[PDB]
Write a protein that binds this ligand. Structure first.
Ligand SMILES: *[C@@H]1O[C@H](CO)[C@@H](O[C@@H]2O[C@H](CO)[C@@H](O[C@@H]3O[C@H](CO[C@H]4O[C@H](CO[C@H]5O[C@H](CO)[C@@H](O)[C@H](O)[C@@H]5O[C@H]5O[C@H](CO)[C@@H](O)[C@H](O)[C@@H]5O)[C@@H](O)[C@H](O[C@H]5O[C@H](CO)[C@@H](O)[C@H](O)[C@@H]5O[C@H]5O[C@H](CO)[C@@H](O)[C@H](O)[C@@H]5O)[C@@H]4O)[C@@H](O)[C@H](O[C@H]4O[C@H](CO)[C@@H](O)[C@H](O)[C@@H]4O[C@H]4O[C@H](CO)[C@@H](O)[C@H](O)[C@@H]4O[C@H]4O[C@H](CO)[C@@H](O)[C@H](O[C@H]5O[C@H](CO)[C@@H](O)[C@H](O)[C@H]5O)[C@@H]4O)[C@@H]3O)[C@H](O)[C@H]2NC(C)=O)[C@H](O)[C@H]1NC(C)=O
Ligand SMILES: *[C@@H]1O[C@H](CO)[C@@H](O[C@@H]2O[C@H](CO)[C@@H](O[C@@H]3O[C@H](CO[C@H]4O[C@H](CO[C@H]5O[C@H](CO)[C@@H](O)[C@H](O)[C@@H]5O[C@H]5O[C@H](CO)[C@@H](O)[C@H](O)[C@@H]5O)[C@@H](O)[C@H](O[C@H]5O[C@H](CO)[C@@H](O)[C@H](O)[C@@H]5O[C@H]5O[C@H](CO)[C@@H](O)[C@H](O)[C@@H]5O)[C@@H]4O)[C@@H](O)[C@H](O[C@H]4O[C@H](CO)[C@@H](O)[C@H](O)[C@@H]4O[C@H]4O[C@H](CO)[C@@H](O)[C@H](O)[C@@H]4O[C@H]4O[C@H](CO)[C@@H](O)[C@H](O[C@H]5O[C@H](CO)[C@@H](O)[C@H](O)[C@H]5O)[C@@H]4O)[C@@H]3O)[C@H](O)[C@H]2NC(C)=O)[C@H](O)[C@H]1NC(C)=O
Ligand SMILES: *[C@@H]1O[C@H](CO)[C@@H](O[C@@H]2O[C@H](CO)[C@@H](O)[C@H](O)[C@H]2NC(C)=O)[C@H](O)[C@H]1NC(C)=O
Lengths: 674, 674
């Protein structure tokens, strides 16, 4: 298994090394590094001519002269002041006329501003600026290790750095601390191996997977809710569509993990009753432990009355719009069948900039999601604008760790899916592919297993004045057994009459509902996980297609550590996926953990005529190369019919799991010491 | 300290004497008085030609022939039938062609109608009729002493009257009954000296202050929610602005009293959870005690299910309008920034006539304030249209005695202040006064203390057939120590470039929040109490202004008993404030009770260019002589800026309290007997 690579020129390489020079030892400043001198004395005012937008720069300066979030404090985009500052900073980065002015602005920020705040605006700018297109971003877990690993292993790294090494390596092994080469390796367990407060803990290997969490972070920085989608041209008109697709797909995938663990559907809650599923983040900031929400949390308390009424009102509005058939307000009146209605509900639920026709949201345009994250996070109200007790719900990099995150968005998609039943359902004729028929589909054995995975966590530690004189160590390694599966083929048999360009899609869906009974397309159309999308020229007669799971376009390879990125740069290359598909879900997670006896699911292949791609979303996500609605044909209900189309095939499938069932078993000292 | 007086001609004096002739021994009828014969035989039908609006008079007769509230029963403008009768009566009074016809109509009413009802319509007619403009109104506590004093002292007066004097004066002293001259003086404690059911009771000297309660009553009769603001020209368009101003100032002032008493912010509540703070009115009607709301009252019971859904719906509508950026309904469509928006939210929350574009409100036009006062009052449903158990929330003269009164309006203004954040914030430029700078502000020591205050409470008692044959006694006096403060100067130091006409305002704001930390303008702009407003001619160079607290235009002098009014009329004079500023907050209450060590607050002086006064509200309140929104520049949030404007100055201040801290200490027999 070789990783696909891509060729880059000398300019790109030079810009790549520059951006990476600002992603090192992020919680500390190195006066020996070139960036410190540049950044410390950069005069934004004096170079105001090197920015395409003078107003944005002046607003930044005006804001900056008043002070920004101090260093070391936690930064969260869900807090007004912090967000506005971060956004002003983003504008300073985005409007730099050229890479050089941008780099200097970045260095300025790195030296003067809050590390978290800088990293946030930095990450987004690299994604948004045209001149940095293709630039490979370092893994978020490598940049925010304190957000991707529990305190028990963070504390072990702290103890190692404080002791300046291992004092008794033979004893350290019993605490998962091993030395390999010149690296210190830390075997890190998911939380279900240290605390089991509720049954949802059984899903910890999935909800705490660094790749899954990185995936949500990438989703957000690819296109922040506070920013307009203008830059992406077409996506703007299809933004709400993308919202639905992303969350439906994520919720459905999470649902599958629940199913193979016997946890049933995503729980429903009320803002007027205790929230059943609590959550205890084993994370910490530099000033406080993350807030905890005990099981059966009394959410309807005096501190949340007003917020709950707002959330209620927000839901009420939508439900009433569905009833009367029209969305009023926001400067327009949309009937449910309007051609922009789909984008409206999506933008409405997310309360994004595009809902208002602006480039950035304002503080007074209150958000359902932000307020809901606030009350579900269970944190006491902020001490002040710059100080708050964070919860898993305050970061896109830790959101998926909280069971209520899925419950919140499942509630939202719940309404979105209700809205979809008011639309014209897909007719049997529009779904039919005259001349095309799928005679059979055979799927190879589906097997999951846990496999060790390492990543650089050195950013967890603080370097010595002497250590800063020499090259960075990239000394610490965090090792966790992560979910994965064996590659598998899908053999498709297609009997055709005429020759035509066809599109073939591969989905994965449940076979039974939570109670073990047969699924129903009428109520379960939204439970199909899109796995593949590709064009294929169908020749008259017999057509045999073989798609290997490693080829599914929906997923990407694991990221490589910054150190391997450099070696690859010497060759004038960059990982293909890491550069162009950084937002895709890691392929090692395309399958939910199976069971020893094999858990029931079904694959489905659908092939339809290839045609218009005039309003595709390639500038956003590469695989979106058609005009059909995202998730087609499971994007909305379908005109109930008891006789399936010949161009769609459903194949039963079983997901088995090999090796140790529980991930923590691979971190038992007796085991890894062999 | 001399009280300001105003000269009045003979015509005014005779009308003043005529109006006061109907404010004597109000719960009884005097056949020996001139008004009795006049009112008993007055024929409205026959004199219909003396009313400018015949339809109104016919409606009154049609309604009167069916019967009105009987004598002795409690009257409240919050009960449908009662309000409708009162409004009909008002029209009869208002449409009288000349003073004489008005007086007869009033005499007729005094004789035939419910005393409370008559007094209600009468008070308002005197304020609204043009020919009675300036006519001095007797203090509400003199007219309705049973609404301004607890039953313990009401019963003492009853006992005195029944015994026809004191049987054992030496002994009566131990109960606060003392004879002075020809008066019987009753030392009257606030409820916190007889029952301490919850911590809010420590605010009783304030919430029960007769002046504070009279103030709210004056606010009502000056312009009832059921009547249109048409009479006041410009006010009509700014009605909502005045609504926000009145309640925000009152709520802020209340907040200040909580701060010096360690009671923090105004509590928030939910219609679906027990209301924490109860209230026990130590008041009674002629037929029943006032209803009581115990602590942690179960408000969400079957009797209130439907009313709560209404209240909840009313709030939902506002919250959704804010979210969609437009107010729909009531015959129009108003975007948040529309020029008519501010008045809409005001008229909406109040459910007043101007909301519907009518003269007076109708029964089916359900009111949030009324329904909320109904469920918060905790009284069982009315026996019938004429019989109900009253709560402190059923009267404008007792409302401030109930903690939930503040909680309810704080909830409404919460929404109002939320709406304010959707408006164009005051820009730094517009707040800047070019060439004008406030160099310094010095405030003399702020000191509060309790000082005895007496008022005529003879209306509490019933007179003898013989006593009615001679002049009214004005025999009984209620004595209570009331909050007060020493006069203080505010020295303002201004450095100007050129000469201009400037407006200088003075505010009092908190220094710290309820937790003891620094206030923030972005979140506490609504907590600034306006204290003074005046024009001043600034000359080039150094300017020095000296304003004494006694000169603040926002406050008035205490009311004089009706007996002192007569003596003053004989000199062709009337108190200046009682005549033109009756609705102003008593100046003795401008400062919250301080603490021995001195409680922190801050004074702010802001000076801006004097200009337009085209849409001023002088006809309503004298001090509103500008075009600026009421409360400027703290009427809405301001473009956040850490750099203060040169024409504004903040000065730390400490409010000290001298003498006994608790008011009841002055009502201890050992103390007042010396
Ligand atoms: C415990 O607990 C407690 C309780 O809580 C606490 O306390 C706290 O604390 C805190 C901290 O400390 C604090 O805070 C702070 O404060 C401070 C002070 O303040 C003040 O002052 C200021 C200044 O002033 C000045 O300036 C101005 C301008 O700007 C002007 O105007 C004036 O006049 C003056 O002048 C001057 O200046 C200068 C000096 O400085 C010179 O030039 C000369 O001298 C001149 O003359 C100011 O600004 C302020 O203001 C304020 O206030 C007032 C009143 O008072 C007012 O009026 C105003 O307006 C303002 O206010 C307000 O506003 C609003 C309200 O409405 C809001 O917003 C707020 O409140 C505000 O405030 C005063 O006066 C200060 O300084 C600081 O600052 C800082 O921080 C912040 C945040 O926090 C930011 O924003 C800013 O920016 C800054 O930053 C900085 O720092 C930090 C740390 O801290 C960091 O992180 C950052 O990064 C930065 O850094 C920088 O700086 C530093 C110093 O500063 C240094 O060191 C550094 O360096 C380094 O690094 C670099 C790189 O980067 C390198 O290169 C090198 O090498 C190294 O070295 C840098 O440079 C703050 O703010 C508070 O306050 C307290 N609280 C209380 C209640 O008290 C404690 O802490 C604890 N403790 C423990 C142990 O834990
Ligand atoms: C206990 O508990 C119990 C239970 O709760 C109770 O009971 C109650 O009681 C009550 C009280 O008493 C009652 O009520 C009452 O009643 C009565 C009776 O009724 C009946 O009758 C009437 C009358 O009739 C007549 O008239 C007419 C017209 O108008 C006609 O039509 C007829 O026919 C007749 O005629 C005749 O007679 C006359 C006389 O009157 C002559 O002219 C000749 O003879 C002729 O022929 C009537 O109206 C009524 O009716 C009604 O009802 C029916 C049924 O039955 C019906 O059908 C009808 O429609 C009617 O209505 C109804 O209905 C509706 C609808 O549904 C409703 O709303 C209701 O139901 C109604 O009702 C009958 O029949 C009566 O009378 C009375 O009245 C009164 O009151 C009221 C209120 O309440 C008012 O509004 C009115 O106006 C009146 O008033 C008066 O009185 C009062 C007192 O009470 C007062 O306050 C006032 O102010 C007034 O006064 C006046 O008068 C009097 C007499 O009455 C006198 O006395 C006085 O005198 C004074 O004056 C001056 C001062 O200002 C001086 O100057 C001198 O000097 C002095 O003296 C005055 O004048 C009532 O209503 C009830 O009923 C019961 N309930 C039950 C259930 O039963 C008890 O009470 C208790 N007890 C204890 C002790 O606590
Ligand atoms: C009054 O409201 C309108 C719309 O609600 C505001 O107009 C918007 O202004 C922003 C600029 O910040 C534009 O990006 C939008 O396209 C405008 N939308 C519409 C519908 O006009 C207007 O700014 C508000 N009034 C003021 C003075 O700001």
């Amino acid at each position: 298994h070789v990783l696909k690579t891509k060729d880059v020129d000398t300019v790109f390489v030079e810009r790549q090394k520059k951006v990476l020079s600002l992603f090192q030892d992020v919680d500390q400043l190195n006066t020996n590094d070139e960036y410190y001198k540049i950044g410390k004395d950069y005069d934004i005012e004096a170079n105001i001519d090197n920015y395409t937008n003078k107003k944005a720069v002046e607003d930044f300066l005006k804001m900056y002269r008043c002070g920004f979030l101090p260093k070391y404090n936690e930064f969260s985009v869900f807090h007004d002041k912090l967000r506005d500052e971060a956004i002003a900073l983003f504008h300073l980065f985005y409007y730099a006329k050229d890479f050089d002015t941008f780099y200097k602005s970045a260095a300025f920020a790195r030296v003067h501003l809050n590390q978290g705040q800088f990293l946030y605006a930095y990450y987004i700018a690299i994604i948004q600026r045209k001149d940095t297109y293709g630039i490979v971003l370092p893994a978020p877990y490598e940049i925010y290790p304190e957000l991707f690993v529990n305190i028990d292993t963070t504390y072990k790294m702290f103890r190692t750095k404080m002791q300046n090494g291992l004092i008794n390596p033979e004893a350290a092994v019993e605490y998962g601390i091993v030395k390999e080469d010149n690296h210190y390796v830390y075997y890190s367990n998911y939380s279900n191996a240290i605390t089991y407060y509720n049954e949802e803990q059984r899903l910890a290997y999935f909800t705490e997977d660094i790749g899954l969490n990185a995936y949500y972070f990438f989703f957000h920085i690819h296109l922040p809710f506070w920013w307009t989608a203008e830059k992406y041209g077409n996506l703007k008109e299809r933004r709400g569509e993308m919202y639905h697709y992303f969350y439906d797909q994520l919720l459905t995938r999470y649902y599958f993990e629940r199913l193979t663990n016997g946890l049933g559907t995503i729980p429903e809650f009320s803002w007027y009753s205790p929230v059943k599923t609590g959550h205890y983040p084993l994370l910490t900031s530099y000033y406080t432990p993350f807030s905890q929400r005990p099981n059966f949390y009394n959410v309807h308390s005096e501190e949340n009355y007003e917020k709950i009424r707002f959330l209620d009102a927000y839901e009420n509005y939508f439900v009433q719009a569905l009833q009367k058939g029209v969305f009023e307000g926001f400067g327009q009146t949309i009937y449910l069948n309007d051609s922009k209605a789909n984008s409206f509900v999506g933008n409405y639920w997310q309360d994004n900039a595009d809902l208002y026709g602006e480039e950035v949201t304002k503080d007074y345009q209150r958000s359902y999601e932000i307020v809901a994250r606030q009350v579900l996070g269970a944190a006491p109200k902020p001490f002040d604008k710059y100080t708050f007790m964070p919860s898993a719900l305050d970061f896109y990099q830790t959101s998926l760790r909280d069971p209520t995150f899925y419950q919140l968005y499942n509630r939202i998609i719940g309404y979105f899916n209700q809205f979809k039943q008011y639309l014209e359902p897909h007719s049997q004729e529009k779904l039919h592919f005259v001349g095309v028929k799928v005679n059979n589909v055979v799927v190879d054995k589906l097997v999951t297993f846990f496999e060790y995975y390492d990543f650089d966590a050195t950013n967890t530690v603080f370097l010595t004045e002497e250590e800063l004189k020499t090259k960075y160590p990239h000394n610490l390694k965090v090792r966790q057994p992560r979910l994965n599966h064996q590659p598998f083929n899908i053999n498709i048999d297609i009997k055709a009459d005429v020759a035509t360009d066809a599109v073939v899609k591969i989905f994965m869906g449940p076979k039974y509902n939570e109670n073990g009974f047969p699924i129903t397309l009428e109520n379960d159309w939204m439970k199909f996980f899109e796995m593949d999308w590709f064009t294929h020229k169908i020749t008259p007669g017999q057509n045999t297609i073989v798609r290997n799971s490693n080829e599914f376009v929906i997923f990407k390879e694991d990221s490589l550590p910054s150190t391997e990125l450099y070696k690859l740069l010497e060759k004038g290359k960059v990982p293909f996926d890491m550069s162009e598909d950084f937002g895709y879900l890691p392929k090692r997670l395309m399958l939910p953990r199976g069971t020893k006896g094999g858990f029931p699911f079904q694959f489905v292949v659908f092939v339809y005529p290839f045609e218009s791609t005039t309003k595709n979303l390639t500038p956003y996500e590469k695989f979106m190369i058609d005009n059909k609605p995202l998730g087609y044909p499971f994007d909305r209900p379908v005109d109930t019919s008891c006789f399936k189309q010949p161009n769609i095939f459903f194949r039963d499938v079983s997901v088995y799991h090999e090796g140790e069932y529980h991930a923590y078993e691979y971190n038992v000292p007796a085991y890894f010491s062999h």
